[PDB]
Amino acid sequence: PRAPRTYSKTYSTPKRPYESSRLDAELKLAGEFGLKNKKEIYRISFQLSKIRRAARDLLTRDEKDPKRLFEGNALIRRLVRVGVLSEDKKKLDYVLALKVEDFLERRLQTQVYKLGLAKSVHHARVLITQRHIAVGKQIVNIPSFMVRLDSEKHIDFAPTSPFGGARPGRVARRNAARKAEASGE
Amino acid sequence: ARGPKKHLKRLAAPHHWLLDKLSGCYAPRPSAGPHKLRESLPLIVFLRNRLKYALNGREVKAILMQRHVKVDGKVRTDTTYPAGFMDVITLDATNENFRLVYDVKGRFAVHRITDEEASYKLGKVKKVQLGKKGVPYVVTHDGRTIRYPDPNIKVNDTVKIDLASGKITDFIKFDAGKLVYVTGGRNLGRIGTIVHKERHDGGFDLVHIKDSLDNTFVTRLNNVFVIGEQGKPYISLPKGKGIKLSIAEERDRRRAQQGL
Amino acid sequence: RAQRILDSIENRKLFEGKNGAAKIITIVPLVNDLDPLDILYKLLKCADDEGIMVQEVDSKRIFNVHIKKFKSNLKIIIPDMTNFLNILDCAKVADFVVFGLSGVQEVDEEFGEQIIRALELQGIASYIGVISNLSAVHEKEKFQLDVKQSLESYFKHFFPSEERVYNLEKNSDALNVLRTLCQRLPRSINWRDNRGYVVADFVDFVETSPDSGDLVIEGTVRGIGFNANRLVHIPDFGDFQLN
Amino acid sequence: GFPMKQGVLLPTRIKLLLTKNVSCYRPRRDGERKRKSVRGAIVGPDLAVLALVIVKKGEQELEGLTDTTVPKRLGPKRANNIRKFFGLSKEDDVRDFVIRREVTKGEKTYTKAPKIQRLVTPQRLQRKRHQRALKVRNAQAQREAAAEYAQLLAKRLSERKAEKAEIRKRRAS
Amino acid sequence: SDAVTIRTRKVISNPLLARKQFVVDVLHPNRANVSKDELREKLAEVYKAEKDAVSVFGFRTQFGGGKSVGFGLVYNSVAEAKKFEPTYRLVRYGLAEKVEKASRQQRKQKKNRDKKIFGTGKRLAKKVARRNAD
RNA sequence: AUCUGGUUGAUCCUGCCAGUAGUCAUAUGCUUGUCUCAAAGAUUAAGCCAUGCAUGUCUAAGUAUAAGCAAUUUAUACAGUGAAACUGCGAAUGGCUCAUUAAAUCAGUUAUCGUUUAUUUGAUAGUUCCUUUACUACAUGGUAUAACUGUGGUAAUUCUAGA
RNA sequence: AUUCAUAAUAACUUUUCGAAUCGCAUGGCCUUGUGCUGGCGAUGGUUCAUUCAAAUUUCUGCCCUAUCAACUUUCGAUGGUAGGAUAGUGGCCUACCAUGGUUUCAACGGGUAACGGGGAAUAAGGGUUCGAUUCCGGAGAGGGAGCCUGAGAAACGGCUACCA
Ligand SMILES: [Mg+2]
Ligand SMILES: [Mg+2]
Ligand SMILES: [Mg+2]
Ligand SMILES: [Mg+2]
Ligand SMILES: [Mg+2]
Ligand SMILES: [Mg+2]
Ligand SMILES: [Mg+2]
Ligand SMILES: [Mg+2]
Ligand SMILES: [Mg+2]
Ligand SMILES: [Mg+2]
Ligand SMILES: [Mg+2]
Ligand SMILES: [Mg+2]
Ligand SMILES: [Mg+2]
Ligand SMILES: [Mg+2]
Ligand SMILES: [Mg+2]
Ligand SMILES: [Mg+2]
Ligand SMILES: [Mg+2]
Ligand SMILES: [Mg+2]
Ligand SMILES: [Mg+2]
Ligand SMILES: [Mg+2]
Ligand SMILES: [Mg+2]
């Protein structure tokens, strides 16, 4: 006797397991963006899919019907806040045409490398999970943050971080102590 | 089971209390009283969930035990007292007066009330009848029995009641073209004028109602509750005035009250 | 199911701990710097019986301990840990083998490990993994449980039947292992159970002829039993015939 | 150990279902009954103890009995019970005749006394006065209400006869 | 370079429980989160009440750091605080004392043994001493 | 909104076997660092159970001569606190399991002009000794009882007897 | 929609209820009797109403099986009258009458490793398969039966008996 804590899966494993084409596509996709599981890809494929379903289910209904209007506009403006859907494509028929990379391109991981705070994408990984990289007043340490558009123009280093400001890290002051003590001697 | 149940599980509580579903496992089963379980609000809910005046349950008992909280002029000290529709609630230490009337969205709403409106109360007349020694009386929805009413008052009529003496000030008849709050059902929380009453014998009467935006709907007579006259209500309606808007209209109204 | 239950009662009547029982538990530490007398002390101090502990310190190594909590007749045996073959001989007659483990000292690759393996090969009934040295490490539980679990994963390797190395330092686990020793029915080792065996409590000798006589042996029979006509073996003595 | 029970005319033991107001039993729970062994009423060779009362004193004194005497633990608590224990008139105030006890502690010796029950005091007279009051007051108020209502009713019927007068004059015209 | 800033939001004046309740924001950069004691001190001066007439709890330091939210009440006197607050809080503030009562297990066991005694029991004590001397 | 290998010398078929994917579904093997969260003796044996606990309850406001505690400041009826016990209320809720059960249960929907209802809430009550203003407690009848005092029984119980 | 509510007559009754109760304040008014009055609230109490219920109840809906085709009625099966019982309708039971009631639109019987539903898994759709289990309803407390107390139990952290 509680309420039963609801919960759900997030991804979905491919239907054909060994398919030299899908295999590769996936690998290059992990490569552009430095993902670690294929699972990271699947998660995207899956959200995408739920959106394509909502999309169609709206599409089959009459234009100027309250529901298609309401949920349509919502789905649209939601897709826009994260800048997955461009400003000009603001009509359902494009949200179908959406593909995976359009989602993979809004990760904090990605935007860190495309706002040039990192040297390579992998660098951006490390830098994120290292508690270095803030979005405004918040630190964020998940590579999958999914940057909204109005939060693009705030991403910087953490006021906590060595690069952001503050004091040097543990290694730095370790070597500072080593050289200072070795010279005092 | 064997006797009456004394608990209420969390999920099984009437939804429009808006109890969150991880706070506990139980929910304040309303005591026996003036109103039906399903459609009443236990004071603890009104006090801790809707006024935020107390954080726990025992804080609420604490409050109630100083004879602070009145209901219909009188002091109740039962955490699970069932204050339902159109009841007056008095918090003297804040010098506030509340009325339990339905929000547009079918739930109970906080409503501040002047001292001059707190004095009285409306009551749907659920049944008139003749009691012992031939003395005629009415029974009004909040359970109140009133003796020697005016013979013009039959069923479904509303009655104004001085909370002080418990006597009948005046009343209102159930005729076409009156103002009306709809209490039970889906359209619960709406207000409008009664177009015409549909009469089905041995079954449920319906009522067509047309609101102030000249839109129409239908409910059983069971949920129709008379207020007053065209734009001349006897009680003060909340904001919203019992006018229900499509989700589009509400979306727009909300996004149009944002300019910082 | 009634048949099953009947049969089970019949098979659990060999240890009617009031008159006809003899549960042999052998205590085998696997670490040099460890005391078996102590391990017993824990198990019987958690039975709240100070007398049966004090009466054993004076002079003994084999005990007839009756527990009243569970109503059971245990027989405890502690081996000469200087003789390997005496350890093997001790365990190979047991209904239960307790293993002492050190929180301080890692078990020896050349000795204690070989105890494990050899016991395991010759035959073991029901075995248990138990500790005593756990308090010798840090006072905070956070570090003790580490040792405990590493020991659990070491002990699981040779004895996968078990997953819980019990800690006698805590009253609960000690009460629980005692509980098991009392209640739980001990599994069977094929070759020893099919020819019978008696552990001797009292051994007296009667002279009949000047050059030979009659060894008298008072003990409880376990296994298949003995016949007067069949021979009896006695370890490091040979095969002899019954009179 | 099983006790004898008055009623059971038998020189042995027999199991009974005992209830609320009987011997040999105390109901643990409301309305509960129980089956218990009980000893017969007729004395035999098995009885460990026989419980006896003295009705007529004999010629000789009994040491542990007649020689000693024990005071009754508690005196009266109700007003008229007191009045019977001291044979007082109706007009004698019971307050003074109340038994007290002299308890001792430290260097102080304090005295206790039972609360008098059913004792006529100004308070109960007040409450009774209040009862006659609210009853009569209520009755008169009620008569007032039915009078006002009958007045209303009678005026409405006359209004109805005037209306029917107007309608009869309009139908005749 | 710290600057402990203490903000009080969603404030309500509650005469029913003779107190004012509110949310507590705390901006504490470089600071490894602020002690509750300290907080009470700094709130007292602000709402002009005794340090004992103020209560704060439920503080949760945000992710990454340099901030934390909690909740805070402040009564009209310390009398009322003493009579309205939950006791364990008044133990956190020393304003009352933890009452040493035995374990739950224990207490229940005593209750249960005492169930098996009808009456005062000094009777049974005289009787059992008597039957033991016997 | 997908299939692939297997009958033949080779071919196209019917056809299955095999393979493949899911299970917010059990078990098991091997492996296992961190956050949040969560189910867990249902399946077979509604099989059996040591011990401990899960149901008790008192306010300004039912009953206190504890031969209890506090003494103390007005109380010689009581009057602070209060074990015990009588009274009152509860123990019919909760929790568990899924054995029974196939128009049964249950779902939705009706009915009670076909009934009971502690409780809550609201109303609700001049009439209740003999004669006609004379006679009988209404400034208020009566009795048992417990706890307790003391005497006892029995291996034993949450046994109880006599006074 | 009523023989309803209610009223009236005539009587009836091992005569139901109609405050011998409690805590706080202690005041008015006089013929000066310590006389008559007098606030707030607690508990109780009859009836009606209300609330919480409860019990019955109408329509429609359940998995497999014809290697189950006829089933129900002495012993209630279906209906009528009257009674008895029940809080109450009612073959619920008892007398007395009838001779009915179900059935290839699958009754009756057998099976279920069957509690029912809200729901779960999976499918483009249509489906197939799960639902002991967090909410609702029901049933049971080793198996049967019986009953006290009480508004409410055929109760088992109540009682009684038989069987294990
Ligand atoms: Mg239940
Ligand atoms: Mg409805
Ligand atoms: Mg297959
Ligand atoms: Mg089971
Ligand atoms: Mg379970
Ligand atoms: Mg008191
Ligand atoms: Mg009432
Ligand atoms: Mg008498
Ligand atoms: Mg018949
Ligand atoms: Mg009939
Ligand atoms: Mg079943
Ligand atoms: Mg398909
Ligand atoms: Mg289910
Ligand atoms: Mg099952
Ligand atoms: Mg259930
Ligand atoms: Mg039951
Ligand atoms: Mg069982
Ligand atoms: Mg009861
Ligand atoms: Mg039963
Ligand atoms: Mg039980
Ligand atoms: Mg139960």
CSV table of N, CA, C and O (backbone and C1' of nucleotides) in Angstrom, one decimal, chain E residues 105 108-113 115-123 126-127 130-131 134, chain F residues 52-54 56 83-85 147-156 158 160-162:
chain,number,residue,atom,x,y,z
E,105,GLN,N,10.4,-2.2,21.8
E,105,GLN,CA,10.4,-3.6,22.2
E,105,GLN,C,10.1,-3.7,23.6
E,105,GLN,O,9.1,-4.3,24.0
E,108,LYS,N,6.6,-2.3,24.9
E,108,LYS,CA,5.5,-3.3,24.6
E,108,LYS,C,5.5,-4.5,25.5
E,108,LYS,O,4.5,-5.0,25.9
E,109,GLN,N,6.7,-5.0,25.7
E,109,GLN,CA,6.8,-6.2,26.6
E,109,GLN,C,6.3,-6.0,28.0
E,109,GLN,O,5.6,-6.8,28.5
E,110,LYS,N,6.6,-4.8,28.5
E,110,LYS,CA,6.1,-4.5,29.9
E,110,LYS,C,4.6,-4.4,29.9
E,110,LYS,O,3.9,-5.0,30.7
E,111,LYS,N,4.0,-3.7,28.9
E,111,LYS,CA,2.6,-3.6,28.7
E,111,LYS,C,2.0,-5.0,28.7
E,111,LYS,O,1.0,-5.3,29.5
E,112,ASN,N,2.5,-5.9,27.9
E,112,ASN,CA,2.0,-7.2,27.8
E,112,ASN,C,2.1,-8.1,29.1
E,112,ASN,O,1.1,-8.8,29.4
E,113,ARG,N,3.2,-8.0,29.8
E,113,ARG,CA,3.3,-8.7,31.0
E,113,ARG,C,2.3,-8.2,32.0
E,113,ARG,O,1.6,-9.0,32.7
E,115,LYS,N,-0.5,-6.9,31.4
E,115,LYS,CA,-1.9,-7.4,31.1
E,115,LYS,C,-2.3,-8.7,31.8
E,115,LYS,O,-3.4,-8.9,32.1
E,116,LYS,N,-1.3,-9.5,32.1
E,116,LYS,CA,-1.5,-10.8,32.8
E,116,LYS,C,-1.6,-10.6,34.3
E,116,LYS,O,-1.5,-11.6,35.0
E,117,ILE,N,-1.8,-9.4,34.8
E,117,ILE,CA,-2.0,-9.2,36.2
E,117,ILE,C,-3.3,-8.5,36.5
E,117,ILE,O,-3.4,-7.3,36.1
E,118,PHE,N,-4.2,-9.1,37.1
E,118,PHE,CA,-5.4,-8.5,37.5
E,118,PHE,C,-5.3,-7.8,38.8
E,118,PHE,O,-4.9,-8.4,39.8
E,119,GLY,N,-5.5,-6.5,38.8
E,119,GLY,CA,-5.4,-5.7,40.1
E,119,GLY,C,-4.0,-5.2,40.4
E,119,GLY,O,-3.1,-5.2,39.6
E,120,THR,N,-3.8,-4.8,41.7
E,120,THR,CA,-2.6,-4.1,42.1
E,120,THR,C,-1.4,-5.1,42.1
E,120,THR,O,-0.3,-4.7,41.7
E,121,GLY,N,-1.6,-6.3,42.6
E,121,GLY,CA,-0.6,-7.3,42.6
E,121,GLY,C,0.2,-7.4,43.9
E,121,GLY,O,1.0,-8.4,44.0
E,122,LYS,N,0.1,-6.5,44.8
E,122,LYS,CA,0.7,-6.6,46.1
E,122,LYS,C,0.1,-7.8,46.9
E,122,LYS,O,0.7,-8.4,47.7
E,123,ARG,N,-1.2,-8.1,46.5
E,123,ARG,CA,-1.9,-9.3,47.0
E,123,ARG,C,-1.1,-10.5,46.6
E,123,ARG,O,-0.7,-11.3,47.4
E,126,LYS,N,2.3,-10.8,48.4
E,126,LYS,CA,2.2,-11.4,49.8
E,126,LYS,C,1.9,-12.9,49.7
E,126,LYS,O,2.6,-13.7,50.4
E,127,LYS,N,1.1,-13.3,48.8
E,127,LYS,CA,0.7,-14.7,48.6
E,127,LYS,C,1.9,-15.5,48.1
E,127,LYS,O,2.2,-16.6,48.6
E,130,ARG,N,4.6,-15.8,50.7
E,130,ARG,CA,4.0,-16.7,51.7
E,130,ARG,C,4.2,-18.2,51.3
E,130,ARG,O,4.5,-19.1,52.1
E,131,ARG,N,3.9,-18.5,50.0
E,131,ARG,CA,4.0,-19.9,49.5
E,131,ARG,C,5.4,-20.3,49.2
E,131,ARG,O,5.7,-21.5,49.2
E,134,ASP,N,6.7,-21.2,52.6
E,134,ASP,CA,6.1,-22.5,52.9
E,134,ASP,C,7.0,-23.6,52.4
E,134,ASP,O,7.5,-24.5,53.1
F,52,G,P,6.8,-15.2,24.0
F,52,G,O5',7.3,-13.9,23.3
F,52,G,C5',8.4,-13.2,23.7
F,52,G,C4',8.7,-12.0,22.9
F,52,G,C3',7.5,-11.1,22.5
F,52,G,O3',7.0,-10.3,23.6
F,52,G,C1',8.7,-11.5,20.6
F,53,C,P,5.4,-10.1,23.7
F,53,C,O5',5.0,-9.2,22.5
F,53,C,C5',5.3,-7.8,22.5
F,53,C,C4',5.3,-7.2,21.1
F,53,C,C3',3.9,-7.0,20.5
F,53,C,O3',3.3,-5.7,21.0
F,53,C,C1',5.2,-8.1,18.9
F,54,A,P,1.7,-5.6,21.1
F,54,A,O5',1.2,-5.6,19.6
F,54,A,C5',1.5,-4.5,18.8
F,54,A,C4',1.0,-4.7,17.4
F,54,A,C3',-0.5,-4.8,17.2
F,54,A,O3',-1.1,-3.6,17.1
F,54,A,C1',0.6,-6.5,16.0
F,56,G,P,-3.7,-4.3,24.2
F,56,G,O5',-4.0,-3.0,25.0
F,56,G,C5',-3.3,-1.8,24.7
F,56,G,C4',-4.2,-0.8,23.9
F,56,G,C3',-4.6,0.4,24.7
F,56,G,O3',-3.6,1.4,24.8
F,56,G,C1',-6.4,-0.4,23.5
F,83,A,P,-3.5,6.7,36.7
F,83,A,O5',-3.2,5.2,37.2
F,83,A,C5',-2.0,4.6,36.7
F,83,A,C4',-1.5,3.6,37.7
F,83,A,C3',-2.3,2.3,37.8
F,83,A,O3',-2.1,1.4,36.8
F,83,A,C1',-1.7,3.2,40.0
F,84,A,P,-3.3,0.8,36.0
F,84,A,O5',-4.2,0.1,37.1
F,84,A,C5',-3.7,-0.9,37.9
F,84,A,C4',-4.5,-1.2,39.1
F,84,A,C3',-6.0,-1.5,38.9
F,84,A,O3',-6.2,-2.8,38.4
F,84,A,C1',-5.8,0.0,40.7
F,85,A,P,-6.8,-3.1,37.0
F,85,A,O5',-8.4,-3.1,37.2
F,85,A,C5',-9.0,-3.9,38.2
F,85,A,C4',-10.2,-3.3,38.8
F,85,A,C3',-11.3,-3.0,37.9
F,85,A,O3',-12.1,-4.1,37.6
F,85,A,C1',-10.9,-1.1,39.3
F,147,A,P,-11.8,-7.5,43.5
F,147,A,O5',-10.9,-6.2,43.6
F,147,A,C5',-10.1,-5.8,42.4
F,147,A,C4',-9.7,-4.4,42.5
F,147,A,C3',-8.8,-3.9,43.7
F,147,A,O3',-7.5,-4.2,43.5
F,147,A,C1',-10.6,-2.4,43.3
F,148,C,P,-6.7,-5.3,44.4
F,148,C,O5',-6.9,-4.6,45.9
F,148,C,C5',-6.4,-3.3,46.1
F,148,C,C4',-6.9,-2.7,47.4
F,148,C,C3',-6.8,-3.5,48.6
F,148,C,O3',-5.5,-3.5,49.2
F,148,C,C1',-9.0,-2.7,48.5
F,149,U,P,-4.9,-4.8,49.9
F,149,U,O5',-5.7,-4.9,51.3
F,149,U,C5',-5.6,-3.9,52.3
F,149,U,C4',-6.4,-4.3,53.5
F,149,U,C3',-6.2,-5.7,54.1
F,149,U,O3',-5.1,-5.8,54.9
F,149,U,C1',-8.5,-5.2,53.8
F,150,G,P,-3.9,-6.9,54.5
F,150,G,O5',-4.5,-8.3,54.9
F,150,G,C5',-4.8,-8.5,56.3
F,150,G,C4',-6.0,-9.5,56.4
F,150,G,C3',-5.8,-10.9,56.0
F,150,G,O3',-5.0,-11.7,56.9
F,150,G,C1',-7.8,-10.1,55.2
F,151,U,P,-4.0,-12.9,56.4
F,151,U,O5',-5.0,-14.1,56.1
F,151,U,C5',-5.8,-14.6,57.2
F,151,U,C4',-6.9,-15.6,56.7
F,151,U,C3',-6.4,-16.7,55.8
F,151,U,O3',-5.8,-17.8,56.6
F,151,U,C1',-8.3,-15.8,54.8
F,152,G,P,-4.4,-18.4,56.1
F,152,G,O5',-4.8,-19.5,55.0
F,152,G,C5',-4.9,-19.1,53.7
F,152,G,C4',-5.9,-20.1,52.9
F,152,G,C3',-5.3,-20.9,51.8
F,152,G,O3',-4.6,-22.0,52.2
F,152,G,C1',-7.3,-19.8,51.1
F,153,G,P,-3.5,-22.7,51.3
F,153,G,O5',-4.3,-23.4,50.1
F,153,G,C5',-5.1,-24.5,50.4
F,153,G,C4',-5.9,-24.9,49.2
F,153,G,C3',-5.1,-25.4,48.0
F,153,G,O3',-4.8,-26.7,48.0
F,153,G,C1',-6.8,-23.8,47.3
F,154,U,P,-3.2,-27.2,48.1
F,154,U,O5',-2.9,-27.9,46.7
F,154,U,C5',-4.0,-28.0,45.7
F,154,U,C4',-3.5,-27.9,44.3
F,154,U,C3',-2.1,-27.4,44.1
F,154,U,O3',-1.0,-28.4,44.5
F,154,U,C1',-3.4,-26.2,42.7
F,155,A,P,-0.4,-29.4,43.5
F,155,A,O5',0.4,-28.5,42.5
F,155,A,C5',1.8,-28.1,42.7
F,155,A,C4',2.6,-28.0,41.5
F,155,A,C3',2.2,-26.9,40.5
F,155,A,O3',2.8,-25.6,40.9
F,155,A,C1',2.5,-28.9,39.3
F,156,A,P,1.8,-24.3,40.9
F,156,A,O5',1.5,-24.1,39.4
F,156,A,C5',2.5,-24.0,38.4
F,156,A,C4',2.0,-24.3,37.0
F,156,A,C3',0.8,-23.4,36.5
F,156,A,O3',1.3,-22.2,36.0
F,156,A,C1',0.3,-25.7,36.1
F,158,U,P,-0.9,-17.1,31.5
F,158,U,O5',-1.7,-15.7,31.8
F,158,U,C5',-2.0,-15.3,33.1
F,158,U,C4',-3.4,-14.8,33.2
F,158,U,C3',-4.5,-15.8,32.8
F,158,U,O3',-5.6,-15.7,33.6
F,158,U,C1',-4.7,-13.8,31.6
F,160,U,P,-11.0,-16.8,36.0
F,160,U,O5',-11.8,-17.4,37.3
F,160,U,C5',-11.7,-16.8,38.5
F,160,U,C4',-11.7,-17.7,39.7
F,160,U,C3',-12.3,-17.2,41.0
F,160,U,O3',-13.7,-17.4,41.0
F,160,U,C1',-10.2,-18.2,41.4
F,161,A,P,-14.6,-16.6,42.1
F,161,A,O5',-14.5,-17.5,43.4
F,161,A,C5',-15.0,-18.9,43.4
F,161,A,C4',-14.8,-19.6,44.7
F,161,A,C3',-15.4,-18.8,45.9
F,161,A,O3',-16.8,-19.0,46.1
F,161,A,C1',-13.2,-19.6,46.4
F,162,G,P,-17.7,-17.8,46.7
F,162,G,O5',-17.2,-17.8,48.2
F,162,G,C5',-17.4,-18.9,49.1
F,162,G,C4',-16.9,-18.7,50.5
F,162,G,C3',-17.2,-17.3,51.1
F,162,G,O3',-18.5,-17.2,51.6
F,162,G,C1',-14.9,-17.9,51.5
